[model samples]
Target chain A: HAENPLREEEWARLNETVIQVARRSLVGRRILDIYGPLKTIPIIYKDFLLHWRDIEAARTHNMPLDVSAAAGAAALCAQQEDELIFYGDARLGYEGLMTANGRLTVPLGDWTSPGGGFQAIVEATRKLNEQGHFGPYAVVLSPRLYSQLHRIYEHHHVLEIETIRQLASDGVYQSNRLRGESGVVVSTGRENMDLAVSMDMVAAYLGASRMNHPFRVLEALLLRIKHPDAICTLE
Target chain B: PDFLGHAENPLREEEWARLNETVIQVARRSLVGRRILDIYGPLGAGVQTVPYDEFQGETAMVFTDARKFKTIPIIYKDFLLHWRDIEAARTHNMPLDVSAAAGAAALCAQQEDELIFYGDARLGYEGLMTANGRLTVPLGDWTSPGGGFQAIVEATRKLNEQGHFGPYAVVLSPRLYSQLHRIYEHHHVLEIETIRQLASDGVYQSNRLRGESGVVVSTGRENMDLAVSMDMVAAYLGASRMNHPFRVLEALLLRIKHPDAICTLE
Candidate 1:
């Protein structure tokens, strides 16, 4: 039997902070709830910082390490878990939910061109449908491409703003993550991409038995992508 | 007052050592992050050696029909990060000891990642773009509002015309990534699928691409190929003290063999 390192009050505060940030950070992106049983482990706060910097740098989330930093850290941690579920590695025994099996290239013609119009989106959706992936797919794109969709709205008066909103359950998500990158990804809602967690983020304290380090935090989880064909990206 | 005796204690030294080991474990796992060597290397190819000192070598192959071989050199580049005034910080506050140890670990890992990716430091062997007989992607159409897809396809087509075949890979900066991502559907659908068909390989994103992004399209054809050679091992010089409880010096060494590939896109 071992005692926890963090005091009850300190642990509660840190846990509350992490959850609050995760909820507010990425607006529409869903966190997988169907994880396994909760497991507890003590993570070094310093190690958490190292991991935090790595995620922020990779995704270009340049934020200072202050009270506000925890949210970004938590969101990125969750996203990494999400990706592990999405693009699984066989060596790691992760069976990914979806693969980018079909690549749909939207020819770059005029906005009104046959290859470059709203019809292209419809065509993509139709292709997915033909591939056995039906409606209720979420569209994630860079801000620039997202704005281009707004232009499509202007061109097609029959398309109302709400009509576009009606397309995806989460509406459309414009991500810096997808910024300045090519392709549009359409994914089935979380039903196709789910995760199992034995632990959510928690704070734990380690005593002198645990080396010189005292504070630690960690979450244990697994990800499963049930339908590999449920997502397609239009590059 | 009694801190000095405790500072020299073997138990304290043992603690730092354990922390170092933990940090290295995390770093070792991250080696899979970004590496052109891992991506393009023609693994298990028979090794050839040139004079280590007066290193003069000729081209195994070049992209263009220049029929020219230039003298090449095997160069060594060292990456170093020095920690100054660790003792003072630790003396001021015992808690600073934990921060300093963690800081050193993270710093070493960060530097190791960077050097492995962008450490080439010789003429024509400068890096991904300047290394042994690299090629360029004539993205002349990139300035156009939505010409990203066209530009990439053009690059791929040129490579194909030159007789290079898939699988191929593209590496670019986040800016270019954003620009590419912004290439709308009405724009993307056409290029997304088309590029995949053209490049059986994958499109990888990297922050290391820096100012000018480069694409390396390899035939993935056997033995007669191009690739990277790294020592594939990392060694820590071990922590040493410099007259301070907090101040310590740590060094990590890696042997990187630059790519001698014939084809590259700039």
Candidate 2:
């Protein structure tokens, strides 16, 4: 039953290491918590392919997760999990917050500079509030889009991001998942939307190959929005 | 094998009976998740992981590289009892502050419910209601005629649209649980018996919800489950502060298989 014949203490050590990497590598879970909390199902439900686009969405199952290279591989799975949460699979069932149903698209104001960053937050917040989704908001951005927001207005003594934070009190976050100048503003409420997770990211043991044992760092989840009006897109 | 290592502690049959029975009694009654969802294992405290079965995309009913397993951890809480309380009862020939032991188990029960519904964001745990890919419907006025009967139907229908039909079960907050029973009896436009019929899987009441919220779930193990390694038990930690410390603990996590199987009545 025991493969490598590791002691109980050793088994505990391996688990701690796997759990640590998976936690540090996620971003959407943080934002998901602020909104309401997360949702879950089990890890083993399968559907007929025709039902795939109906209620069935996809979770990114990162394979060949090397325990020897756990820190490196687990990050890829977690990064992909965050990606699937923010941007659903290209042809997967439902869309993510980036491309969800009924979302409002607000054209951006050149976030290459400081002024545009501040301006979009205002308009995005307005778009949400005007539609009756006033909120303690969450602002998420591409790290590329994030850098420009840190500069001083210089016209005033205020820093750009600090001012933006006062508005999006839920917290502003950055991710490699977003591309240049791509970000979203969403209300913090379960009524608006949530992530339906079939599985939380965990290291699944994958027998042995040669002398090396492998694992898969994977999860099953989908993003569901009940009221798309609560989201404002900055592109 | 006893997971709690109770044999190592200083105890008599009388004290042990009080601690054991009270924890099992309170946690059993207090937890709504335990009643609603499928229970997998108290597979003993020694086991650290459970088998994870993933069959998809022709999913190669066979794979050389995937052993298909997930890790589980034992979560626990502890309290320190003063030496005075122990001897006072023993010398006085009365029961120990067994009520205090029940208090510890109650905290553990409360924790399991929070983990069941809200999830531990700090850990990589996922919750049932707050899951990412579930349906959300704004709660309409329930105190109106037949109070929330039609709105509750929408949740059932919503799950059906997503390909999940009944044996629908509804879990409600304590307030909603009480308010729902007041839907006046009438054969005309509403009958409360039909409400029971719709949520045939059972309407459950839990104190764990925030306030006036209900979640209608398409019931089955295929939708959700709780993986338990060791359920609630009283354990001895060690001697400390001229007294002894004890714990109440369990190992389990909530797992969701179909995010779409949930319809939250927000």
Q: What is the alpha-carbon interface RMSD for each candidate?
A: 17.9, 24.9
Summarize candidate 1's per-residue lDDT along A143-231 as a digit string, tens digits. Answer: 34543543222233333223555655555654433424433435555666665666666545444432232334456666555565655
- Residues B1-266 of candidate 1: C-alpha lDDT, one tens digit per residue: 33334234322455456555655554455442343232322122122321112111166955332222333222222222233434444456433234444455455545545554465464332334444544556655445443555556556545545434334566656666555444443332323333343344565666556764646545221212123333222233433442333322222222223232234444
Off by over 4 Å in 1: A1-6, A26-72, A82-117, A150-163, A182-191, A206-214, B1-266
TM-score of chain A, every prediction, order shown: 0.62, 0.79
Per-residue lDDT of model 2, residues B211-258, tens digit only: 788898876554566777777888888675456788888888676777
The whole-model C-alpha lDDT of candidate 1 against the native structure comes to: 0.44
Candidate 1: C-alpha RMSD after superposition: 18.9
Q: At residue A55, what lDDT does model 2 achieve?
A: 13
